[PDB]
Structures are given as structure tokens and as C-alpha cells.
Write a structure and sequence with these properties.
The structure is cut from a larger assembly and holds chains A (about 150 residues), B (about 50 residues), C (about 270 residues), D (about 290 residues) and E (about 90 residues). Helix content of chain A is about 45%, strand content about 5%. Chain A contains 6 helices and 2 strands; from the N terminus they run βααβαααα. Chain A has helices at about 10-15, 35, 55-60, 80-100, 115, 125-150, and strands at about 5, 45. Chain A is flat. Classes of the chains: A mainly alpha (about 150), B mainly alpha (about 50), C mainly alpha (about 270), D mainly alpha (about 290), E alpha+beta (about 90). Chain D: Belongs to the peptidase M67A family.
């Protein structure tokens, strides 16, 4: 929101440096090179800003943006939770075979070479610990949410 | 020959007929991962045990 | 008009295999009826003989409504009374279908079809609950298909005795079958004597009736022949117990969601100001 | 006919700033304004609004005023600056459903066919969403009369927009409970949603305030639904509800055991990757 | 009248309280399901029916005391189970 305002080209012809800095508040942000290509400091000047906040709006946006209504008190497709759980584990097996593949070129050429070299084909490591987290948070939430309703509902 | 399955009674010839595949896809697919990872830990000797 | 002739010559030979071809030339050749009140109807009178015979009790649907369509027939009411006869004797004869189950609403809602007092009740039979077997049915409607001015396609039922046999049978599915439908709907488990008493025939013939529908798998049932304990719609369901339980959870939370905003306005129409 | 509504933070603040600029009246003023927006695919949208001048006296509380010149000129300007934007309904500041809002909607139904209202909050506190929208419905019944134009709350939510998320999320910079692991579910619905069921539990308890002391309508249409609630109490822990539960928990904890099994091996392999970084650095550097 | 403990009645009881014979009560209850005032299932061999959903009726100021009491401990069920969540799940998110 870099707001500006004109500086006098008359005073530019005078060669007189304007705006008489009396406070360490102006030269804090650094200007963009594209504005330096444009007028910037030959025709106008920069202005620092801030934002006026209160308490009253901050809460009524914070509590009013993304509030799930009763969603976690559901069961999430009770046939297909475990079926999707299969649908990750099945290729997680062969990705674990890649984890039985990628360990076996250690004690080899200088693992920065193992950093430049793994740029064409996927690693089992990061891809593995992805799916472990996905199955974990996929299962535990449905597990507990399945069990609150047995107490709360009779 | 397992093309049909059930039972055959000998006293009076009764064929209780029943069928369901309970769970097949799950425990074996989670199982062969374990025997992959055991081989991985066997490979971890050859970068860990001999090394340091 | 020339090309619609020779299909009667093929039907003089009883050539279905050519009759459907040369009629398939002209099934796309519609929209000439607008100056021929009868010649379009002559195309249809050869379409029964292709369709009445073998099994095509659903191909005579658009036939019979199509010969109800023609606006000349409406002013020859008694020859149009047998068009009311034609518009009922094939919607029922037709085997069970979604096309039947809305076709009954196509023919239903008619101001002038219920002028026959019998056949509004005849369509009332198949929509509603259990049908009076057959013998108590033919006591009420086996004679009205002989008496009256509407008697002539009911003589197409009766008179030709083999078409007769097909329609005594062309009802034999329907009712003998209708009961089986709501038995599968409402009966969890029944013996192999109560059902056969509700069919008024043998337990052996009852097993022949329950065989060809489950090898058709249009009714799923697991019968018994030692204690006769037969049942309907019995899987094991490791899933739908807790699944439909969760459905009751969702409907429950929606239900308590319903009353909550309903109460507040009711307080506001008494205790606002 | 209307499925649900979509409310923006721009209109949401755009009631509040007007409430501040009338905030010097002090005594009593509802902030009635014209709600603008569209609806597509039977999904109601609200994007812009303004506020009509409005005064109302307590004695003979049926005397309301909308400056339709202020309606037509400013809506003509808003159509001119945006022909895509149009009317969608109205709103009022809505503490507790004021009485003239039975015929405000009838006063300006000639603009929008589903002239919707929106009740907002100016003192923001709840354990839910302080955003409301009814709909005008009239249904003669067998326990009243003809004119039965009551209001029915269509469900509501705060919709987002790619334009406004950038500036809004800039306008927070304060606190943001991201890093969704399990904690976001555990707190936004396993902590919060149970207390959501607390208030809906408590509301019929507030209605139950009529046993011998409350208002005059006794039952009629309140008890079929509650009768369906206590009819709709779920199955007890005896029949087969136990067996499939131990079945599927007995399947879920398998997969949990697999993931927890592999995770330690991952961290072990990383510890090997760290001791190679230790032992071939202490001698090399010195 | 029958509680959610069972709400499962028999054709002997129907033949007792309606004094109508054994070979008519099935047509009666199938007619009731066809109308749809009641929703349930029919077993023939054990002569019982699992009636589930009933047509809702009206009631006086006395049954709201019973619905009040069934509301009452249902409140503290939600309180009691939720207190485990607030107490145990406290250290996850302050």
C-alpha cells in the first residue's frame, strides 16, 4: 500500500533537498527498485503507514471465519474409512520396498551426490513419513469420534 | 475341490451352505511391509554396526 | 402406404425376422398421421402380431397408448371403450419394471378411464397392499370380462384359448408374484406352510415359484426344507449396523437442530414487548 | 427453495462501522440496511450492503420508515459501479428479533422475491456463529388462521473469497490455530462441538419453562419432534452394537500399530544419519 | 406404551387386546404398515413383530415431567463425558 505524494520539481530545479528529516521514522522501509526506476525520489516521496485495530472487530472476525459446526461429531464414511486405510497401505508396501532399495546405496559416493542425484526419482523417506502421518491422523480422529457418541448418545 | 463349499452330514445328508470373505486385503498387506522392514534393519547393520 | 402393406404378407408367413426389419424401415417414418386418421392406425394393427405373440407385453405399451392417441376414435365411444380395454390389458400383463411403476401413473390420473368402474379398482389392486390370491379375485372379476359392451378385448383374453392360457398365466405372475414382493418387503422370516397357504397351492409349486426368481436374483431369499424356515433379505452386515447407526446420529443432530431455532420465535410472539 | 447463504467479512464489518457512526444515539436504534448480492445454483450470496436511515419510537411500535429515495439513488449508483452486483434482501442489527421485522420484509418484498433478512451481532460472544438468516414463509394451518407469514431460519455460514482472504489474514497477524494434526479436530469439534450440543440441549430446557408457569400455547407442534427424539434414542450396548464395534476398532488399531511401528524406524535411521555426522566430524575438524 | 427396552409385541397379545383371531392380525398389521402410521418388521415363526417407529401423538402437562426427567440426566451425561475431554485434553491446546 505504498502511498505517495508529489514533491516539488521547482525545488528539484533549485537543487534543494526537501522534507527536512527531524525524526527516525521515515527511512525505515527500503524502496523498490521499480519505483526507483520511476519517479520515487525525483517527483514524490514515500509515506509510512500502520493499521488502526480495536478489540471489537478482531474477535468478531476471529470467532467468525472457519468454525466447523458439528463435523467432528460424525463418522466419515464408515464403509470407506477402513477401505481408504487399505488404499494407502497397499502402495505403502511397495514404497517400503523402495525403502528396502534406497538404504542399500549408503557407504557410497558422498551423500551430497545422493542429494544432486535424487532429482529425477522419488525418495521413499519423505514420501513414507507423509503416509504414516496421513494414516495416523486419519485413524485416531475417527477412532475417538466414534467413541464419544457411545457415551453421549445413551 | 473347493469350487463349492459347505458341509455334508452323514446321518441324514444335510448341506449347511454359508459364504463370506471376512477380511483378506488388510492383514497380509500390512504383514509383508514388516518383512520388508526387517530386511531394511538387516541393511542398517551394514551402514551402522560396522561403521561406528 | 405401399411399404406398410407387405408386412402383412410376411406375417402371413409369420416372419418376425423380416417383419421387424421392414417395420423398422417405417418406425422412424412417423409424422404423416396428420392427414390419415386411419392409415397410421393400420401401421399399428400389424404391430400387435409382431408383439402380442412371443413375449412382448411391454412392446404393446406404446402400441396401445398409440392407438389411444388417435383423435378420431374418441367420437365412436363404444369402439373407444375397447380402447379403454386395450389401455389396461397390457400395463398389468407387462412384467415388473420402473417403466411399469410410472406407467401406472401415466395411465392413472385419467378422468375418463375411471368411467369403467372396474378398472380404476384394477389399477388400485397393484398399487396397494395384498391381493386376494386369485380364486377370490376371479369371483369378482372373471365374469365382468364376459358381460358388457366392453367385452371384446376381454374376448381377446378368453376366446382364443392359448392366448387365454397365456393371460390366465399373464396374471399368474403378477398376483402370485405381487404377494411375493410384499412378503419380501415385510416378512423377516416365515414358514413353508403359511406362505403356501397365502398362495393356495403346493409347497412344491411354491418352491418352483421361489426358485426361478432367486436364480433371477430379483428376490433374494434363503429357503429351508427341513424346518421350512424361510426368510428374506438376510446378509450378515458387518458395516450397516454402525453405519446406519451413524445415520441415526446425523438425523438425530439435525432433529435437535430443528426445534432449537423454532422455540425462540415462539417465545418472541409472546414475550417480545 | 433457498439452500444456504454465504456471508462475507466485508459486509460483516460494513454493518459494524455504520453501527458506530450511529453509535451516538445511545438509547435505542436497530441498524436496518439493504442487503446486496446474488444467488446462483440456489446458493445465496451476500457481498455488499449499505444502511438505510431508520428511526422508530417505542410507543405504537409499528411506525417504521425507509427512505426509498436513499434506496433508489444509492442502489442506482451501485448498479452503475457494478452491474453484476444487485439486491439480495435486507438485514437488521438483530439482538432479539424486533417486531417490525414482520413487515419490513413485506415493505420491500417488491424488490427481491426471496427478500431475505440477516440478523447479526454487535456484542460478539457465543460458542458458535453469531450470524443468522431467516426466510419468509406463509402456511395456513389447522390451528390458527390465514396470514401465517412466520420466519424460518435457513442455515448460514461465513463464506470466503480469494480476494478477501489475503487482506483479512493480513488483518489478523495475531493468532492462528493452524498446524492441523489431530489437534484441530480435537479442539474445534471434540472440545467445542460438545459444548455446541450443550446449548441445543439447554434450549428445550428453556422451552420446558411452561409446565405450569410459562406462556399459553401448550404443545400442538412441539412434541412430535421431541417424541421423535426420545423415539430416536440410539441402540444400547448389548445386542450387536458391541461386536461390530470391537470388530472395527480391532481393525483400526492394526493400522495404527503399523504406522507407529514404522515411525520409530524412521527416527532410528535418522539417528544413524546423525552419528555419521558426529564421528566423521570430531576427528576431521578437531 | 412399550418402552425402548423392548417395544416388541406378539400376536397372542394382539389377539388378547384386540380380541381378533390369529389369521387376521397379520393383515391388520400389514395394513398398518401400508398406511404407514407404524414402521416395523414382521417375524412369523416366533409370532412377534419388531415395531420401531410409531405415529406421534399428543400429551398433557404430565408427560413433559417425564421428558424433563429424561432430559435431566442426559444433560449431566454430556457434562460428565465432556469433563474428561476438558481435563485430559487440556495440555494439547491451552
Amino acid at each position: 500500500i505504498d502511498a505517495f505524494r508529489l514533491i516539488n520539481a521547482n525545488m528539484m530545479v533549485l537543487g534543494h533537498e526537501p522534507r527536512q528529516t527531524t525524526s527516525n521514522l521515515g527511512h525505515l522501509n527500503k524502496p523498490s527498485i521499480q519505483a526507483l526506476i520511476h519517479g520515487l525520489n525525483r517527483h514524490y516521496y514515500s509515506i509510512t503507514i500502520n493499521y488502526r485495530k480495536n478489540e471489537l472487530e478482531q474477535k468478531m472476525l476471529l470467532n467468525l471465519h472457519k468454525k466447523s459446526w458439528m463435523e467432528g461429531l460424525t463418522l466419515q464414511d464408515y464403509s470407506e474409512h477402513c477401505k481408504h486405510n487399505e488404499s494407502v497401505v497397499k502402495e505403502m508396501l511397495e514404497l517400503a520396498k523402495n525403502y528396502n532399495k534406497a538404504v542399500e546405496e549408503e557407504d557410497k559416493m558422498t551423500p551430497e551426490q545422493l542429494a544432486i542425484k535424487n532429482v529425477g526419482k522419488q525418495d521413499p523417506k519423505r514420501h513414507l513419513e507423509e503416509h504414516v502421518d496421513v494414516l495416523m491422523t486419519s485413524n485416531i480422529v475417527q477412532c475417538l469420534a466414534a467413541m464419544l457418541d457411545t457415551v453421549v448418545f445413551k | 475341490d473347493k469350487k463349492f463349499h459347505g458341509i455334508l452330514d452323514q446321518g441324514e445328508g444335510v448341506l449347511i451352505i454359508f459364504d463370506e470373505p471376512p477380511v483378506d486385503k488388510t492383514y497380509e498387506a500390512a504383514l509383508e511391509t514388516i518383512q520388508n522392514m526387517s530386511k531394511v534393519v538387516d541393511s542398517l547393520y551394514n551402514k551402522a554396526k560396522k561403521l561406528t | 402406404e405401399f411399404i406398410l402393406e407387405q408386412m402383412r404378407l410376411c406375417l402371413a408367413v409369420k416372419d418376425y425376422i423380416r417383419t421387424q426389419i421392414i417395420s423398422k424401415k417405417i418406425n422412424t417414418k412417423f409424422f404423416q398421421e396428420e392427414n390419415t386418421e386411419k392409415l397410421k392406425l393400420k401401421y399399428y394393427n400389424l404391430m400387435i402380431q409382431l408383439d402380442q405373440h412371443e413375449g412382448s407385453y411391454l412392446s404393446i405399451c406404446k402400441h396401445y397408448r398409440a392407438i389411444y392417441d388417435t383423435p378420431c376414435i374418441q367420437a365412436e365411444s363404444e369402439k373407444w371403450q375397447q380402447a379403454l380395454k386395450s389401455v389396461v390389458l397390457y400395463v398389468i400383463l407387462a412384467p415388473f419394471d420402473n417403466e411399469q411403476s410410472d406407467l401406472v401413473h401415466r395411465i392413472s390420473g385419467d378422468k375418463k378411464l375411471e368411467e369403467i368402474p372396474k378398472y380404476k379398482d384394477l389399477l388400485k389392486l397393484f398399487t396397494t397392499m395384498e391381493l386376494m390370491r386369485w380364486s377370490t379375485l376371479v369371483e369378482d372379476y372373471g365374469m365382468e370380462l364376459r358381460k358388457g359392451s366392453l367385452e371384446s378385448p376381454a374376448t381377446d383374453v378368453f376366446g382364443s384359448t392359448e392366448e387365454g392360457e397365456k393371460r390366465w398365466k399373464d396374471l399368474k405372475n403378477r398376483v402370485v408374484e405381487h404377494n411375493i414382493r410384499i412378503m419380501a418387503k415385510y416378512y423377516t422370516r416365515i414358514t413353508m406352510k403359511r406362505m403356501a397357504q397365502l398362495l393356495d397351492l403346493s409347497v412344491d409349486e411354491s418352491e418352483a415359484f421361489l426358485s426361478n426368481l432367486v436364480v433371477n436374483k430379483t428376490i433374494f431369499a434363503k429357503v429351508d426344507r427341513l424346518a421350512g424356515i424361510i426368510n428374506f433379505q438376510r446378509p450378515k452386515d458387518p458395516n450397516n449396523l454402525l453405519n446406519d447407526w451413524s445415520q441415526k446420529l446425523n438425523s438425530l443432530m439435525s432433529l435437535v437442530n430443528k426445534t432449537t431455532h423454532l422455540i425462540a420465535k415462539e417465545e418472541m410472539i409472546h414475550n417480545l414487548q | 427453495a433457498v439452500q444456504k447463504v454465504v456471508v462475507h467479512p466485508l459486509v460483516l464489518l460494513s454493518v459494524v462501522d455504520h453501527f458506530n457512526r450511529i453509535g451516538k444515539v445511545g438509547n435505542q436504534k436497530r441498524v436496518v440496511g439493504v442487503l446486496l448480492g446474488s444467488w446462483q445454483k440456489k446458493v445465496l450470496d451476500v457481498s455488499n450492503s449499505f444502511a438505510v436511515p431508520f428511526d422508530e419510537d417505542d410507543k405504537d411500535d409499528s411506525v417504521w420508515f425507509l427512505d426509498h429515495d436513499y434506496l433508489e439513488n444509492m442502489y442506482g449508483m451501485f448498479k452503475k459501479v457494478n452491474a453484476r452486483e444487485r439486491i439480495v434482501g435486507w438485514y437488521h442489527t438483530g439482538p432479539k428479533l424486533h417486531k417490525n421485522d414482520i413487515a419490513i420484509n413485506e415493505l420491500m418484498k417488491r424488490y427481491c422475491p426471496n427478500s431475505v433478512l440477516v440478523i447479526i451481532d454487535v456484542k460478539p460472544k457465543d460458542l458458535g456463529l453469531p450470524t443468522e438468516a431467516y426466510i419468509s414463509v406463509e402456511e395456513v394451518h389447522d390451528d390458527g388462521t390465514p396470514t401465517s407469514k412466520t420466519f424460518e431460519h435457513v442455515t448460514s455460514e461465513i463464506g470466503a473469497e480469494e480476494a478477501e482472504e489475503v487482506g483479512v489474514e493480513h488483518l489478523l497477524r495475531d493468532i492462528k490455530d493452524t498446524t492441523v494434526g489431530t489437534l484441530s479436530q480435537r479442539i474445534t469439534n471434540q472440545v467445542h462441538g460438545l459444548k455446541g450440543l450443550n446449548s441445543k440441549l439447554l434450549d428445550i430446557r428453556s422451552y420446558l419453562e411452561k409446565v405450569a408457569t410459562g406462556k399459553l400455547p401448550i404443545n400442538h407442534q412441539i412434541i412430535y419432534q421431541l417424541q421423535d427424539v426420545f423415539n430416536l434414542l440410539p441402540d444400547v450396548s448389548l445386542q450387536e452394537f458391541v461386536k461390530a464395534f470391537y470388530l472395527k476398532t480391532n481393525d483400526q488399531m492394526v493400522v495404527v500399530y503399523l504406522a507407529s511401528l514404522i515411525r520409530s524406524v524412521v527416527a532410528l535411521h535418522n539417528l544413524i544419519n546423525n552419528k555419521i555426522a558426529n564421528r566423521d566430524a570430531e576427528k576431521k575438524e578437531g | 406404551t412399550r418402552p425402548a427396552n423392548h417395544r416388541q409385541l406378539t400376536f397372542e397379545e394382539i389377539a388378547k387386546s384386540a380380541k381378533i383371531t390369529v389369521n387376521e392380525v397379520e393383515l391388520l398389521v400389514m395394513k398398518a404398515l401400508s398406511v404407514g402410521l407404524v414402521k416395523g418388521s414382521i417375524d412369523e415363526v416366533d409370532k412377534r413383530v419388531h415395531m420401531t417407529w410409531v405415529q406421534p401423538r399428543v400429551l398433557d402437562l404430565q408427560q413433559i415431567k417425564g421428558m424433563k426427567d429424561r432430559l435431566e440426566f442426559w444433560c449431566t451425561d454430556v457434562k460428565s463425558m465432556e469433563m474428561l475431554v476438558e481435563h485430559q485434553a487440556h495440555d494439547i491446546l491451552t
